[PDB]
Design a protein around this nucleic acid. Sequence first.
RNA 1: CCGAGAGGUA
DNA 2: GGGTATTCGCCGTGTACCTCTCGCAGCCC
DNA 3: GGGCTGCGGTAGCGTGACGGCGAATACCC
Lengths: 108, 1341, 50
Amino acid sequence: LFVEFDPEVIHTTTINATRGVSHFVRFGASPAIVPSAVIHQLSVYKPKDIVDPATPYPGDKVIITEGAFEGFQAIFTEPDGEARSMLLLNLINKEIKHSVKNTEFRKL
Amino acid sequence: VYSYTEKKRIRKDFGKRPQVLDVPYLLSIQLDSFQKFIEQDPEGQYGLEAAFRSVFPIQSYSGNSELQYVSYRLGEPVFDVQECQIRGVTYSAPLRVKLRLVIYEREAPEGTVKDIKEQEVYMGEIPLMTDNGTFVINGTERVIVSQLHRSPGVFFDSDKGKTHSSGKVLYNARIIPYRGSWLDFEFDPKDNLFVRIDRRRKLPATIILRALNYTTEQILDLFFEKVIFEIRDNKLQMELVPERLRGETASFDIEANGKVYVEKGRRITARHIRQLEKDDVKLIEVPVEYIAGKVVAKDYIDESTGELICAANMELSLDLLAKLSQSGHKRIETLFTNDLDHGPYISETLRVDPTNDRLSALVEIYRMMRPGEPPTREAAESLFENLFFSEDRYDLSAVGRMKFNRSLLREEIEGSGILSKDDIIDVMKKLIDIRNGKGEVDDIDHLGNRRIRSVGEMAENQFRVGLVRVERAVKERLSLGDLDTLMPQDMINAKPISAAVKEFFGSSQLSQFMDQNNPLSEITHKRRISALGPGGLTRERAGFEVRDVHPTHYGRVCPIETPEGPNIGLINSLSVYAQTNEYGFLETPYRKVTDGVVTDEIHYLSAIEEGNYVIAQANSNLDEEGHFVEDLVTCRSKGESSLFSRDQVDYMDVSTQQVVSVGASLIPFLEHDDANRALMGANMQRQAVPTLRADKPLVGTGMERAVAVDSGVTAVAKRGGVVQYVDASRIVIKVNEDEMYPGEAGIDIYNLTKYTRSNQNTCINQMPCVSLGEPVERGDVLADGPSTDLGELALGQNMRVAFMPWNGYNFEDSILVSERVVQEDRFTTIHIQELACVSRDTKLGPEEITADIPNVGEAALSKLDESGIVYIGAEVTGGDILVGKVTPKGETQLTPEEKLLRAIFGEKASDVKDSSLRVPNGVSGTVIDVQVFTRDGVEKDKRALEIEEMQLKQAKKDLSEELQILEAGLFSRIRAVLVAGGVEAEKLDKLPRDRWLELGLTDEEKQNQLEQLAEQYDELKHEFEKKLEAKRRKITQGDDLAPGVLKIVKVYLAVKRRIQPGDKMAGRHGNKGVISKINPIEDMPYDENGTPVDIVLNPLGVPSRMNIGQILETHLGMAAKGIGDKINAMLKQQQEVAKLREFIQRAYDLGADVRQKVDLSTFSDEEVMRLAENLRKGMPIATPVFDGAKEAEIKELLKLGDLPTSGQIRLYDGRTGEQFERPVTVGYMYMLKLNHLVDDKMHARSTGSYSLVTQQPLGGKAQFGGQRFGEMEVWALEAYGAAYTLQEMLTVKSDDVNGRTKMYKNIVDGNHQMEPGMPESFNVLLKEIRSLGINIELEDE
Amino acid sequence: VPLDGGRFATSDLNDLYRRVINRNNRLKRLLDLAAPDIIVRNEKRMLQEA
RNA sequence: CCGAGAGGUA
DNA sequence: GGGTATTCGCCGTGTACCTCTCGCAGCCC
DNA sequence: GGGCTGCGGTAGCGTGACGGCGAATACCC
């Protein structure tokens, strides 16, 4: 998180004792100063995607974590929306499909 | 005069000093501390009121709302103590506090709040104290040991030699507060003074003076006296007080009035100072060279320029004198800096200072205290004005202020909790005074520097921590909360308070498990002064002095009851009479001595007050007048045992028992033993198992009564009266009239505690020691507990001992015991194991407790019922099954395809493994008690319902017996009313017993009392209803459990271990012994009257181990049983009471002066025969601690019996039948069975289980483990040539897995050969080193 | 391995390896997302100290 | 079936 | 420029056995 | 309910070992 203050107005001990704050980044004795260019170039940012570590995108490959299909790799055909998903599950004979919630399976 | 039960068996009392103070209640430390903690205490000192009035009223950050406090109250506990120990919950009370919230408006400092509210908030539970001084925390019964920490206040410490490696001493000065930051001043070998706070970095000590808004001139005015130089006609004549001439050499001429007083070259004598002070010599003329080393005092600016000529604390020279002379400054102030008396420490410390003003001083202190974060004026000022000066973050106690004033020789003993400017200045001045010579350093072990925390203080501190955390939470909720919808529980949280107080009572270095196998062990574990704990010193660091007995321990802390081992002298026990001062210090009683007649009044002295007066000895010879019969008597002045005058003394010791404790005031003949064997005797007497038949120590000290009555393992009668009904389980007493309440008719019902488990797996058991229908007095014992006999204390049993070598079977310290001991079952004791079986909810379904058990038959099921739980009374051995528990076995992990297969086609597994609760190895016994506990969401099987109905009928039957026999006593009072006032006798027995009131009685106080008892009876009706229903609720419900367990079954076995070659018996004197051979009766050495001896000790244990007191105990016990045999002869060939009372009076007169005799002409002619029935097993003799029986009285008592005065009887051998030469000592020694039993220490293992991280045998006995063939034994085998023994020892037998499997196969093949291989833990070593960044390998073949 | 109950008697080494792996995964994600200089400096600093 | 804390025996 | 001399922070501090209790709280995802 | 994560707080807690030893640096050239 970034803060802008002056130590005379509110002290660094008071900022350090704020409910929900671990610590200043120090590198040594004093807390670090980020230059104004970093604040300026983190004004407009976040360009690329909705990148999403460890949440499955459709058109990908997953695994199943519970139930009677636990241990079965699956293809996203078409999740129903932003509520559940539908999966092309494998078997040792024939692949099936199922509309399941998002707790009983996780991405590979 | 005595009781009626003191006339059961009155002990023969030696003892010459008439006692003035009776022995106090021994558990007063614990109970008085906790009663000080919880008390509805006005004015707020000391207790919970002090913590609340410290923390309340809560206001927010000017948020126009302020919570205030009214009162507190603790409800009743929901669980009584017996069902608490059985059930496993705490024994605690709810804390119900009535807080009051008032909420201001915006801009109402004096304006009335718009809303008030006052509810009763529940803030957790605090555990109460059982009336014996114990807690019950989670089933277990735990004791808090009183601590012993450094008192709050200033201390001046030497550290004389270890510093500097040069022999120069330093002198530091530590300010220890009760709560807040520490503070230390100290020197350095450059003679500069330094300060440090909380053992941080070192600053020069005057910078904190600059923090206190002091200039350089003010500091120099404080720490130095002025020496005046005046510019005058020539050469700058000087005021010279002759006192400053102490110990100097005249390097210049000392003259005035044209008279050379002291010449240059010579030193200045005190004669010279007296001549100058007599001649009134003040102004003297100096050379200009004398100021060339001196230091200017204050700042002088030149008035022409306004610029500084010289700064303060600058050494002067001739050019500076030429500057100040031409300026106009005629006056020069200087500093007396001489190395003998007034050193220049502060001036040099100012020269070291890198600062000048207050701001740079506060910046430097802030960079010391909290580094890294940037120094700013506001934060640094807030820091230093909160470090020592705020009521919140710094507080000396009142104890701290009293010590901090007494050490500074201040006048008051009250003050502020914070420090001040003059406090720090006086500490630095006193430190400099110690540096200069006046005053001396305070030693640390002095018990006036050394204070006792107890239960109340430590629990109050933890409750204070809980309160400050909850007020931070409340001030968080108050500045953010909405109004008006929150009552004072959305702000509050009972979680931190209960979490803190249960972490203290559960997990602390002092809330420790009670050593409970003895009445004595309880009463000397509660009276314990630990030096360890938080704020205390650790075991494996310190030291010598804190382990060592110091002269202030006389009568405060016991010198001989301390454990040998790693902590000697740290876990010191407290003396008998030693109370605790209101400041927490150790006060001990003394007899006030106004003059030659010693006064009969007592007066308590702390440790610092002892050194001022001069205290007499306890056994100082006085005769009926208070007059010391000598003019010179042993006393002690300042820890110095020296002989002083007859009238210079001020105090006298109260009793001669006061130096020691109850662990070793029960050792008779203590004055005759070495201190080592007294220590071993006390620490073993704490460890004796309660035998099956308590057997009255013949050689006692009289303190057995106080240990029995005070330690609550006997049933002392609350109100005296008449026995109505004695059964083996309850005792019901009808109360005498003058101790009786008018309402609530009242009979005292004492439910005894029968055979049940103690904390050391011994048996605690109370037995009724009174008859049916016997007068008992208030304060008299009614039930003898474990190790007690008729209200006395009886740990071991007293046996016929003989001191001789008997064919080597008692070689080093072994003890050879007859078969008469093991036949009589007189050391046969009872041990009890609690075995639990838990039913956890696991995978593949939870587990059944059914009797349907695989792979076994009726061989185990023959002792199980319909439910699978063993019957009460089953005589089980090792290897049986007590609770049959079965598990869902098969562990297949079938595929998801097979999961769909078993899900559609519907086939269960239905395989199972035995996991029943089995008897451990070696043990036998008897199931005496089965408890079944069940989670409330779980159904009950049939034996659980059977025990539930059993407990329900027992509860209803107990309450019905309470109501019926209380109704019988109530009707007996109604009958006592109905004797007079309209007697209608045959009108009474026709109508039923319910309405005895409606017979003829007028409008008097008797019918008023009948209506009192009638409303009592209707109260008992409604109370019977509500208590039966509440007890049905308690029995019918399921209890809370650990999350994840269904039902718990707890079986209580009861093994009866007798005695065998291998156990450890010992006396009271420090004579330990492994009982070696359990001989038959015949081989024993019998005397010429035919009587076999029982136990044959070793005489070589007497000259080395200098415990000569066991021999006097042997002879005096022999005299005691001689009197007992004579009474048995006079009573067996049975006579009338006259000759018996003559012989009993001869037994109780005995020559010299005692405190006893007896008023034996008064014992009703039946209390003599009952006393002779209790004396026929030997006459009990009180030999007190240091005022005991002399030799000649033992000889005179042996002459009262027909025994020889020598003490030694000729003995024959049972083998050869012929007389031993040189007749030997036989007598009765009271020998104890310690609970280090050989069938608990014995263990063996061929091949059991193997540890997991390294394939090695396990450690312990309870886990079936092997012996640690340790490091030094490997060195011993290297010291032989034993290579192959070592090779199979640390590779095959221990570690190499394929090696030991091939070895076991070779041994059953009959082949003795090992495949050596490589040990596995070495491979684990290689994987750990290789799991670093280190390559380790094995090279070429 | 678990102690007798429903909870595992955990070992200190698995805490240390879990701390190192969590910090290294966060550092991979921040080097992917092109965090600024001081943020990835702190990330590599905490990784060094873990 | 590993660690911490408390106590004890030699 | 190096030659002491003080400070600092790292090492280390008996063996074997036995017993007991207790071993995550919070929490905002 | 649970995966995680290391003081809980709008600071401060630590404070009763002691020796030896060798490197790092302070003071004074």
